[PDB]
């Protein structure tokens, strides 16, 4: 859709669950298109700046996650096609990871980048 493409290249971030790369206006107006019932990041800026960070790199144009070699390697085949990232550094605080396990969402470390 037209909402998952970031409009402007300035002030864009990436989430730590689905690595959704968008602009700061879409994460606040619309939020995470791949998780809205567990994260609820539409309607504020503290939750957008808490889970989603700017420290990320690498950009991919995911279009057919059901048939592509890159989507299975990043475990993003059960997500919506759009702008994604390949290494989103950081970690969630011990304030939102405890509720994700009780609801059935296994928070995985999307950081496939190596350390030294």
Partner 1 sequence: DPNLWTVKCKIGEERATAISLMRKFIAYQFTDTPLQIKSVVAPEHVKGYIYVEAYKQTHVKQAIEGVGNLRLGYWNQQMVPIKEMTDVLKVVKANLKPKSWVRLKRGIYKDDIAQVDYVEPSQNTISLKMIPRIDYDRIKA
Binding residues: 15, 18, 32, 35
**Please, what is the minimum distance in Å from the beta carbon of residue 72 to partner 1?**
10
Query: Would strands 83-88 and 21-23 be described as parallel, antiparallel, or unpaired?
Result: unpaired
User: By rule CB under 5 A, what string of x and - marks binding of each residue 31-50 to Zn ion?
Assistant: -x------------------
Nearer to Zn ion, 18 or 24 (CB): 18
Nearer to Zn ion, 68 or 80 (CB): 80
Q: Report how far apart, in Å, the C-alpha atoms of 46 and of each of 25, 31, 58 are.
A: 13, 12, 25
Q: Hey, what are 11's tokens?
A: 């002030």
Q: Does residue 18 interact with Zn ion by CB under 5 A?
A: yes
The residues, ordered by sequence, that sit 6+ positions from 49 with a Cβ below 8 Å of its Cβ are none
Query: From the list partner 1, Zn ion, none, which binds 18 (C-beta under 5 to 8 Å, kind-based)?
Result: Zn ion
When the beta carbons of 20 and 83 are compared against partner 1, the nearer one is: 83
Rounded to 5°, the CA angle 56-58-59 comes to 115
**Where on the chain is the footprint of partner 1 (CB under 8 A)?**
1-2, 5-6, 9, 11, 49, 54-64, 67-71, 73-74, 83, 86-89, 112-116
3-state secondary structure of 27: helix
Q: Could you give the 3-state DSSP secondary structure of residue 62?
A: coil
């Amino acid at each position: 859709a037209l909402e998952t493409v970031p409009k402007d290249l300035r002030h864009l971030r990436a989430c730590l669950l689905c690595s959704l790369v968008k602009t700061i206006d879409q994460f606040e107006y619309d939020g995470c298109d791949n998780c809205d019932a567990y994260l609820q990041m539409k309607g504020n800026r503290e939750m957008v700046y808490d889970c989603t960070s700017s420290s990320f790199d690498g950009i991919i144009a995911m279009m057919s996650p059901e048939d592509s070699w890159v989507s299975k390697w990043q475990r993003v085949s059960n997500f919506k096609p759009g702008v994604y990232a390949v290494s989103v550094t950081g970690r969630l605080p011990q304030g939102i990871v405890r509720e994700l396990k009780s609801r059935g969402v296994a928070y995985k470390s999307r950081d496939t980048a190596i350390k030294t």
